[model samples]
Target: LPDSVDWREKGCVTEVKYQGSCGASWAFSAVGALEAQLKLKTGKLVSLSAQNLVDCSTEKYGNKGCNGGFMTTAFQYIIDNKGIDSDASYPYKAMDQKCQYDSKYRAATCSKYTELPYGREDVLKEAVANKGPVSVGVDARHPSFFLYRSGVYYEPSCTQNVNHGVLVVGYGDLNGKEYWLVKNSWGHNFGEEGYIRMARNKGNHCGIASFPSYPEILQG
Candidate 1:
């Protein structure tokens, strides 16, 4: 990895996603990391379905789908169910809908997921450097993120509970300041083409370091 690594520049990151009005950012978080996992393992990149997790991964897993969700639970669903369908087959509705899971088109699956130690930016850095990417939570409820387009973003007011799940694809310095390159699910109109650069080494800004997790790619 270079001193500055960008997964998008490395062809490991797909297009920035959009979750719409639904509270399914967690599903986006899961799918983003899973997609990167498959790429890291098989050297193939296919868009998987977050909607499948949104619709079917409820009940025993306790994933609320469009209402809300957890990244760990979504990865668990992939591990338990073998894999999830691709976006071409299941597609994304943004809004919650019924489960139309078809294993025939299962694009990417996970064998396990690891929850990194809290506030351990060193371990978290190693994961991103060795692996492809990871899913992380952050406090995006504040408007500062909306106003944030370029440069290192550090909103101390964003001390609220993590309300959004996003993908940490890479990390590097910006204007001599280190930051985390995170991809958002709010489409291209948001931050830097649907991406955000959060201030790193800031003791879990918006719980970014608190709930960091990513999946283990299952290669066929």
Candidate 2:
């Protein structure tokens, strides 16, 4: 097990909110990973709003503003904009929400890292060292993805479309097979409590489960 890695015995839970045909998978993945990490570190499972990230951070990275965006760009948006929070503070509207001038639930302002690496080993190292979950893009190419079951992650292949996004929570092996433990946003009815295990460094699948590091906060 990696050094800051631990079983999310409590706090973290899977959530699969319908993006409603919007190309906001990147927003969901970004917020989902942050939400899980906050829960793991603080033991508070507060729902971070994906819609907020979509509306606020989309244009900052030249994203299509709901068509699609990159997780790396989203991380930069949070850092530059000082972070985002739950729908309760910045509610989710299927369409973009107009920015309100307030700081009640202001998200954390992350430090900027110009060269954030993206890959399994690099992401894992950053995530574990930072004590957080990593947002990742996956090739959802399996024909039966609409019917995925618990304890089963579709094998990686070049034929699949990389549609959805999720968070890598922890890593471990089962029966000597190493895997990356991930949390999904498709609600709890999908996998093991809405989680899945992808083979680590196998068939280049690990490359798909990669993320960029967030900016560090200055400690007083």
Candidate 3:
């Protein structure tokens, strides 16, 4: 893929949505990975419900759901719970709801998962190339994050603990700036149509490379 690695161009990244006012970006992030891997495995597309994780996580398994959560936490919970349902069937309300996890409505199933070395962009790039999209946690409290509209975002000071999660769909260079294509949960009105191209190879700006993980889909 050279300077670019777009799963959308390669035929994967499915139609998505924003997390709305909910704090369960982790669920959206994990669902993004599973959605991509499902297409990579079955040549089909489906939207996994972030609300399912939100409604089930905090109650059934003991992981933070709507309030806030970790990407790996959601991945682990999905694996432990066996599978997740489709957004088409369950739909995303962007708020806490009841868990209606029925195997009949399941869209994607994870057999296992993998994680990249923390703060290592080298490994992150490799994983994106070999596997697919990945879930990444970052400090969403950065003042400009919510204001990002377009162009590759770069903030030398956007570094701190990760309080939000997003998905790395691909990587590319704009002009001379290298960046990662991040799919956010703040809706299309938030970033560049619900996506952010964050500057990469600058020592993990905004904790983008701090805690990287994703789920592996075995079947859809």
Write model 1 residue lDDT over 120-158, tens digit each, in one string. 777778888888788998888788887887888988787
Give lDDT per model, in order.
Answer: 0.86, 0.60, 0.83
Provide C-alpha RMSD values for all models, in order.
Answer: 1.5, 3.5, 1.9
Once fitted onto the true fold, the runs of candidate 2 whose alpha carbons sit more than 4 angstroms away are: 2-7, 10-18, 36-45, 113-126, 156-163, 210-216
154-193: candidate 3 lDDT, tens digit per residue: 8766884677888999998899999999988777787777
Clashes of 3: 1
Which candidate do you rate higher for lDDT, 2 or 3?
A: 3
lDDT pick, better of 1 and 3: 1
TM-score of each: 0.95, 0.77, 0.93
| TM-score of model 1 (CA atoms) | 0.95
User: What tens digits encode model 2's per-residue C-alpha lDDT throughout 96-192?
Assistant: 6565624578654444433235454645645544555666667665665556675535454433235566666667666667667776665577666
Candidate 2 TM-score over all chains jointly: 0.77
Question: What value does the lDDT take at residue 164 in candidate 1?
Answer: 83
Give lDDT for model 1. 0.86
Candidate 3 residue runs with Cα over 4 Å from true position: 59-62, 218-220
Query: Which 10 consecutive residues of model 1 have the lowest summed lDDT?
Result: 1-10
